[PDB]
């Protein structure tokens, strides 16, 4: 058995509370006008806000094992790391709207505020002996040139791993921006360091490193070959101020946290460390440079769209440009993406079964599917009895409404964006497709502690059952084919 092609993870979780305190990007406090997750939702409780209590809720599993291509496609599906915890927010529940972006130097519009953090970063780092080249093609090219050159600023990538000096600096910067406590040696441990990658992915080699370390000497058509998580650290005359843990991807750089020096203040390295992970991206060849999640309404997370891109439809499975949507999410709405020309939908979109085109013409069918008058809750709840012969031990959700008016962890709703819905399940089941795992899947079988490799699926006990086609939904038929799940 191929440990580094499996993603081995733990049974998923569905964890609801209140929005206040829980939530830490809206703390529970929206304006009417921000708070429900459609106009359909608006209008239902129109007179009547006061009585919804807001709820901050995720779903996700915990990750023993996952490798760089595997991790990729969970980005790509909507889903983030939280050290090894593997998580995103129900879309319909929750109080923000949390939309998953990336983009690339080619989105980028370079503003005054932007090049003025370059301009002074090359001054902060460069000797008057520095001579320029005569002419610079780009920022990229001018940012390559200078930099390595510098005698005392350098950056340097190395393994993801705890030292007492990172979390020194972790402390002072966490205590800046008022998490002045929460910050053991163990959570920046968890949170930044002993990641879940293979052990190639996360030590490499010697040379892997070096040519990383000289990414800024990179000609069109060359790559490196890292994967997987890293840390960039930035010394200034050999002091450490500032740290970048990083997550590379067959696809791009995903940007996982940044922290700096506070006496540094003055060298805007919150928007410096973007710029050259813009440009490193751009110099290693790979198309795609991840933010984590925007939120229109949360200034700390809408800064990200000055670097530019596109925003995942994780009902549809692809990308929308932020420019075409952006005046329709700034009340902090879902969008589920229609082309203008298909019929109104009796359902949810299909997920493992055409596919949207964001470039005609379309619109936001959230409350046609999801809204109070929507399909998506009596399909679920016709699916559920459906799943009961299959021994799936799903409950209907019988209420009126998705919010709370004034808990099993292991209970997801039936319906959540994103997720594959129930009536696709059924059908999965109907054709066949879930005898699909046998011979493919895999349990860590607590029990009888040992490994087992599924064969006969639908003789398993319906609480495997039922844990196996809660994966399913979360990261589809094909990619649960190559894990272990420990029940
Ligand atoms: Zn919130």
């Not at 990007?25 to 708070?35: A, F, I, L, P, V």
């Not at 067959?250 to 020096?261: E, N």
Request: negative net charge; glycine residues 4%; hydrophobic residues 35%.
């Amino acid at each position: 058995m191929d440990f580094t092609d499996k993603l081995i993870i733990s049974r998923p979780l569905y964890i609801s509370d209140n929005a206040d305190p829980k939530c830490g990007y809206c703390n529970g406090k929206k304006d009417s006008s921000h708070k429900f997750a459609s106009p359909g939702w608006s209008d239902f409780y129109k007179g009547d806000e006061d009585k919804v209590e807001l709820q901050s809720s995720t779903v996700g599993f915990n990750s023993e094992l996952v490798n760089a291509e595997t991790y990729d496609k969970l980005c790509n599906l909507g889903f983030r790391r939280s050290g090894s915890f593997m998580y995103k927010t129900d879309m319909l529940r929750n109080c923000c709207r949390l939309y998953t972006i990336r983009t690339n130097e080619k989105y980028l519009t370079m503003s005054k505020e932007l090049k003025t953090s370059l301009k002074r970063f090359k001054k902060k780092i460069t000797s008057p002996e520095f001579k320029p080249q005569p002419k610079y093609v780009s920022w990229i090219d001018e940012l390559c040139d200078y930099e390595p050159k510098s005698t005392s600023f350098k950056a340097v990538f190395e393994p993801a791993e705890f030292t007492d000096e990172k979390y020194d600096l972790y402390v002072r910067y966490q205590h800046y921006i008022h998490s002045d406590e929460d910050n053991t040696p163990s959570q920046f441990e968890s949170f930044l360091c002993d990641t879940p990658f293979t052990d190639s992915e996360i030590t490499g080699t010697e040379k892997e490193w070096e040519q990383l370390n000289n990414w800024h000497n990179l000609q069109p058509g060359e790559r490196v070959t890292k994967n997987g998580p890293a840390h960039e650290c930035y010394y200034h005359n050999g002091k450490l101020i500032a740290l970048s843990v990083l997550d590379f991807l067959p696809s791009g750089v995903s940007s996982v946290y940044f922290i700096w020096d506070p006496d540094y203040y003055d060298w805007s390295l919150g928007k410096v460390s973007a710029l050259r992970e813009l440009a490193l991206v751009s110099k290693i060849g790979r198309p795609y440079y991840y933010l984590g999640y925007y939120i229109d309404d949360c200034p700390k997370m809408n800064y990200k769209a000055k670097f530019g891109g596109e925003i995942l439809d994780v009902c549809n499975q692809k990308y929308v440009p932020l420019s075409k949507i952006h005046q329709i999410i700034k009340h902090n709405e879902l969008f589920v993406g229609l082309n203008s020309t298909v019929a109104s939908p009796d359902s949810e979109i299909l997920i493992t079964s055409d596919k949207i085109n964001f470039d005609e013409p379309f619109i936001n069918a959230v409350d046609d599917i999801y809204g109070p008058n929507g399909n998506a809750s009596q399909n679920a709840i016709t699916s559920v009895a459906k799943l009961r012969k299959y021994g799936i031990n799903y409950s209907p959700d019988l209420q009126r409404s998705i919010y709370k008016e004034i808990k099993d962890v292991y209970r997801i709703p039936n319906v959540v964006p994103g997720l594959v819905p129930l009536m696709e399940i059924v059908s999965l089941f109907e054709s066949g497709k879930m005898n699909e795992l046998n011979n493919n899947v895999v349990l860590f079988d607590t029990k009888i502690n040992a490994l087992r490799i599924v064969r006969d699926f639908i003789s398993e006990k319906p609480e495997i059952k039922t844990v196996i086609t809660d994966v399913i939904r979360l990261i589809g038929l094909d990619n649960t084919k190559k894990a272990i799940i420990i029940i």
